[PDB]
Amino acid sequence: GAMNSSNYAELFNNDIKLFVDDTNVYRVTVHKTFEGNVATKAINGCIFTLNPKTGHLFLKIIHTSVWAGQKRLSQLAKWKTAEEVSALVRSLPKEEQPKQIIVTRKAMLDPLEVHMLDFPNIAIRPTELRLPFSAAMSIDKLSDVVMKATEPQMVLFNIYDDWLDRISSYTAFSRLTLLLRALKTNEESAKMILLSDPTITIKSYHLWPSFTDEQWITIESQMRDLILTEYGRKYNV
Amino acid sequence: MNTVPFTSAPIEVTIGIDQYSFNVKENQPFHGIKDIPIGHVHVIHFQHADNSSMRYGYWFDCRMGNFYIQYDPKDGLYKMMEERDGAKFENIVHNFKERQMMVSYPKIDEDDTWYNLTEFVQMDKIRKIVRKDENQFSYVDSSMTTVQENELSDPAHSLNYTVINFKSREAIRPGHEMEDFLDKSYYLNTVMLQGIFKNSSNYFGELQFAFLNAMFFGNYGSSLQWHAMIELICSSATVPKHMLDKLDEILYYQIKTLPEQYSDILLNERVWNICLYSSFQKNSLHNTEKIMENKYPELL
Ligand SMILES: NCCNC(=O)CC1CCCCC1
Ligand SMILES: NCCNC(=O)CC1CCCCC1
Fold this sequence. Notes:
The structure holds two protein chains of two kinds.
Chain A: E1 17-21, E2 27-32, E3 38-43, E4 45-50, E5 56-62, H1 73-91, E6 100-103, H2 109-115, E7 123-125, H3 140-148, E8 153-158, H4 169-185, H5 187-195, H6 213-235
Parallel strand pairs in A: 1-6, 6-7
Antiparallel strand pairs in A: 1-4, 2-3, 4-5, 5-8
Helix pairs in contact in A: 1-2, 4-5, 4-6, 5-6
Chain B: E1 2-5, E2 13-17, E3 20-24, E4 32-36, E5 42-48, E6 56-60, E7 66-72, E8 77-83, H1 86-98, E9 103-104, H2 113-118, H3 123-129, E10 138-141, H4 147-151, H5 177-182, H6 185-197, H7 200-217, H8 220-234, H9 241-257, H10 263-266, H11 269-277, H12 286-295
Parallel strand pairs in B: 4-9
Antiparallel strand pairs in B: 1-4, 2-3, 2-5, 5-6, 6-10, 7-8
PDB class: splicing
Keywords: fragmax, fragmaxapp, fragment screening, RNaseH like domain, U5 SNRNP assembly, splicing
Assembly: dimeric
């Protein structure tokens, strides 16, 4: 059934599973028309499909051409996502296919279920966690590959860089969700925190800076402070 | 006009004949029902005064044989049986009618309620949903489960309604996932009507039979089937115009006949609100929407 704080360690067991987030699949810029009406212009989007145990990210880039001539785009985005996730599963060798797919939004359940009818043994699950994966486009290297795409494209990343050499996947996921929650609550401040010190660099093959274990504790503390501050600045506390 | 005689009434029971109901006292001199409308299927049904558990009854068509009721004290129920000796049967019934031991089926209501509820219902199709091939009549009760219920346990006592499942490979063409899920016309017209039922009359027959089993026996699987068959039509953008007009008439009589105090358990709020106000056919069921809004505005 639904995934929540009670069964939270299930994410890091040895059953292959994927999170699917579809918030940035259909994105637009808004512009007033010459007549003074409002018009949207679609921009490139992405499906965020993540193995939380290994860090493997299947980033399917959604090029704006897929919306050309189509109606009801938010509803089509749900079925396009499900079509691309099903296509990804079919492309994986049998022993790499997931046993469970957890969707971040309840509106993806029926489209994914219908697209995965051929896979009756793969469970499609909601979650009650409010995961911050929408902020994936605040990661510079991910945003860059999405906006530069001229055609549909899949790009594979490890969203944990090399952290799993030194920490467990439970700890790596907790670090990732802390970073993404901060980028979602105040992107400018979170990015200042991550890059303030110019001696700490991002390897060419990485997404995040090359922090020592000690610097990660400082960083994580600065992110917690940011989130708590904003939550004060927000509710006045 | 035909007759279903009773050997006796040894236990106190409410007997219903179609939409009608009457009470028989324990060992009351009762020998059956006469003046039954030839040309319709009929249902004779029972609720014991002692144990309201298990409503049960029999679907029959008097053109197919001479049927009577006899209480069985071992199995504890009123059983339908066929009499093969036609001269014996006639003689028993004439002697019974002469003594006024039988109650009389009403003349015909102005609304033609039974005809309208059973327009498409045929005994031969009932007997394929209810498989007991040695009898010409079909037993149904409140507890019998459907084939679809049994896939999610005694096969001989099941209701073999046509399985309808909107998230199934039968319902969804590979490559038309979004199309077929949001517009069920393929599944209605090609799979079910052309493929399985052959025509809309057989579809409506099963829909009407499911409703009547839900209403008369409180059979939950039958209620599920009735609503599924409604929802499949309303959720199709492309439906023959004659079918929509006939569906509106079918449902109007069903809603008109449903006891007001059974609406909570026999009507599915989600299906009816979707069908009347959100579906492709939201504007095609004028008579049904009007009686629903006057009789059950609460559900909506
Ligand atoms: N996901 C459907 C489209 N919604 C957005 O892409 C969000 C933008 C952000 C502010 C400008 C207008 C809406
Ligand atoms: N439906 C309640 C009674 N309705 C009648 O008109 C009288 C009953 C009909 C069945 C035969 C016994 C008398």
